[PDB]
Each structure stands twice: as structure tokens, then as C-alpha cells.
Amino acid sequence: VSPVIATLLLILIAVAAAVLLYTWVSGLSANVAGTQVTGKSLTLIQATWAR
Amino acid sequence: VSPVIATLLLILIAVAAAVLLYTWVSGLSANVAGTQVTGKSLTLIQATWAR
């Protein structure tokens, strides 16, 4: 009755690993920060200097 | 029967993530404000001053 018991334990193992892959994949996603785009250059109201 | 069950769970996972990509992409689009273009300079009717 060896084959019958062997097959059962193998089925359970592969199911458990697949579900674990899902959690890891989805957690991996939506895990990217990125950047902001600086606005257009600031208009120059004045440039001057003093002592 | 391991391969048969494994493959099935993997197919479902990839389908779900693809549909989620679509919603996110389309929502990302049409999400840009922009600007208006100020009209032509205002004609000067008068310039004056008082005390």
C-alpha cells in the first residue's frame, strides 16, 4: 500500500508551497517607492548683492 | 499527481495579477492636471497717480 500513502503526502507538500509562493509574490509587488518630479524652474524675481 | 495540481494553482495566480495590473495602469492614466494659458496681455487703458 506504499504508493497510496506516498502519493498523498506529495500532493499536500506541493499545495503548501504554491500558496506560499503567492503570498511572497504579492508582497513583493507594490513594494516600489519611485520619485516625484520637481516643478518647473522657479522664476527669478531678483538677483543682487551687498557688502 | 503533483505536477497537475501545481500547474493549476500557478495559472490562476498569474491571471489575477494581470487583471490587477490593468486597473492600476488605467487608473494611473487620465490622472494629470496640467495648466491653462493666460490670455494675451491686458491692454493698458491708463496709468496715473494721486496724493
Best of A19, A20, A22, A32 to mutate (most B CBs within 10 Å, chain B): A22
3-state DSSP call for residue B27? helix
| Angle between helices B2-28 and A2-28 in degrees, nearest 10 | 10
Q: Cβ(B18)–Cβ(A29) under 8 Å?
A: no
For residue A40, the number of C-alpha atoms closer than 13 Å in the C-beta half-sphere is: 4
CB contact under 8 A, A10 and B17: no
| DSSP sequence for B7-24 | HHHHHHHHHHHHHHHHHH
**Which of B5, B13, B17 is nearest residue A14 as measured by Cβ atoms?**
B5
For residue B29, the number of C-alpha atoms closer than 13 Å in the C-beta half-sphere is: 5
Residue at A13: amino acid letter:
I
What does the block give as the cell for A5?
500513502
Question: Entry resolution in angstroms?
Answer: 4.0
For residue A39, the number of C-alpha atoms closer than 13 Å in the C-beta half-sphere is: 4
| Interface residue B5 vs chain A (CB under 8 A) | yes
Under 8 Å CB-to-CB from B17, ≥6 apart: which residues?
A25, A26, A29
User: B14: left (phi > 0), else alpha (psi -120 to 50), else beta?
Assistant: alpha
Q: How was this structure determined?
A: cryo-EM
Cell numbers 499545495 correspond to A15
Give the Cα separation of B28 and B20 in Å (integer).
12
CA pseudo-torsion sign A13, A15, A21, A27: negative
Under 8 Å CB-to-CB from A13, ≥6 apart: which residues?
B2
Residue at B41: amino acid letter:
S
